[PDB]
mmCIF file with all atom_site columns, C-alpha atoms in Angstrom:
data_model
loop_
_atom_site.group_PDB
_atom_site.id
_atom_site.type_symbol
_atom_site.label_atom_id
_atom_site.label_alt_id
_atom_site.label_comp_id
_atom_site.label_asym_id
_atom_site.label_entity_id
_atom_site.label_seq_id
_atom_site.pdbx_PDB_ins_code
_atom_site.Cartn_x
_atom_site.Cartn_y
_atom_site.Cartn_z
_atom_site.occupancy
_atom_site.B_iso_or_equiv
_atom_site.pdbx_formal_charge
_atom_site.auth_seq_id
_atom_site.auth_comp_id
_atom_site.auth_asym_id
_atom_site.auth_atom_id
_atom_site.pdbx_PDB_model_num
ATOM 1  C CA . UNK A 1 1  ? 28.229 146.335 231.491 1.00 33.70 ? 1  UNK A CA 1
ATOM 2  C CA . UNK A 1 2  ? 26.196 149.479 232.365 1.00 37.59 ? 2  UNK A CA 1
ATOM 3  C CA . UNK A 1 3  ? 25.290 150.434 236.014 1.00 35.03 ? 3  UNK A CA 1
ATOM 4  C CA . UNK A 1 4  ? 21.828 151.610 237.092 1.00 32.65 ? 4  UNK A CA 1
ATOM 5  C CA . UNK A 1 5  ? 21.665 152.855 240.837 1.00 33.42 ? 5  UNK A CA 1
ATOM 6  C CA . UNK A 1 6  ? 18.634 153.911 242.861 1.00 32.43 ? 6  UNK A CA 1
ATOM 7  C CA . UNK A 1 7  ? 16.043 153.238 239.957 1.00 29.83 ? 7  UNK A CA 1
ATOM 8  C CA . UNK A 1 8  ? 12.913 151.117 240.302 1.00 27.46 ? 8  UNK A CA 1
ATOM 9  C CA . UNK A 1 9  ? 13.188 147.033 239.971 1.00 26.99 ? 9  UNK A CA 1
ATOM 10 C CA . UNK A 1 10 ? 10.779 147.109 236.730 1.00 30.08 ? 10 UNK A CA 1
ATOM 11 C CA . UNK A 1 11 ? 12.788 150.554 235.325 1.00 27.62 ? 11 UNK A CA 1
ATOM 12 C CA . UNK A 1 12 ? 16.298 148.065 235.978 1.00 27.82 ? 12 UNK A CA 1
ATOM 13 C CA . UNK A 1 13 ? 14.247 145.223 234.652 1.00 27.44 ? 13 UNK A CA 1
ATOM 14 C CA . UNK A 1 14 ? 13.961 146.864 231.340 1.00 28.81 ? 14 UNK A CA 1
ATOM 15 C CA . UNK A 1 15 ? 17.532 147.995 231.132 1.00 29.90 ? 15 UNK A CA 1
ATOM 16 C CA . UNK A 1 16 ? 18.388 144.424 232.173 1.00 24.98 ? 16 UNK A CA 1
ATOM 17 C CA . UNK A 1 17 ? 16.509 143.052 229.232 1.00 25.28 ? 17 UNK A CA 1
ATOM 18 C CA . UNK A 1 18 ? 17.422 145.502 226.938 1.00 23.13 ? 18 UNK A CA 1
ATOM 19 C CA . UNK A 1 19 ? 21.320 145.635 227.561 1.00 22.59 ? 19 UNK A CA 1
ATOM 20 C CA . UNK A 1 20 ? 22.281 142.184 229.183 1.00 23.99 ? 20 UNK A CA 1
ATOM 21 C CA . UNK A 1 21 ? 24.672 143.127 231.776 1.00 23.54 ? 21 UNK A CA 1
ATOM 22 C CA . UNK A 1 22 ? 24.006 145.830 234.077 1.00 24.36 ? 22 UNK A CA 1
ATOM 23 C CA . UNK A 1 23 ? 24.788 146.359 237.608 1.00 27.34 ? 23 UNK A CA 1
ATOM 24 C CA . UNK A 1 24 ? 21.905 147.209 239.081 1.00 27.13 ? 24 UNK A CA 1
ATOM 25 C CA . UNK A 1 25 ? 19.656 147.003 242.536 1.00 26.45 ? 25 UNK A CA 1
ATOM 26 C CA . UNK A 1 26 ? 16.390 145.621 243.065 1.00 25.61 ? 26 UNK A CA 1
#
């Protein structure tokens, strides 16, 4: 699982959707 911190909700929903598990905020 990859982490994404203090990036946009779309930006995270992109890396959610192109690499499944990441730990990211909305």
């Amino acid at each position: 699982c990859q982490t994404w911190r203090x990036v946009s909700p779309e930006e995270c929903r992109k890396y959610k959707e192109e690499y499944x598990c990441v730990r990211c905020t909305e």
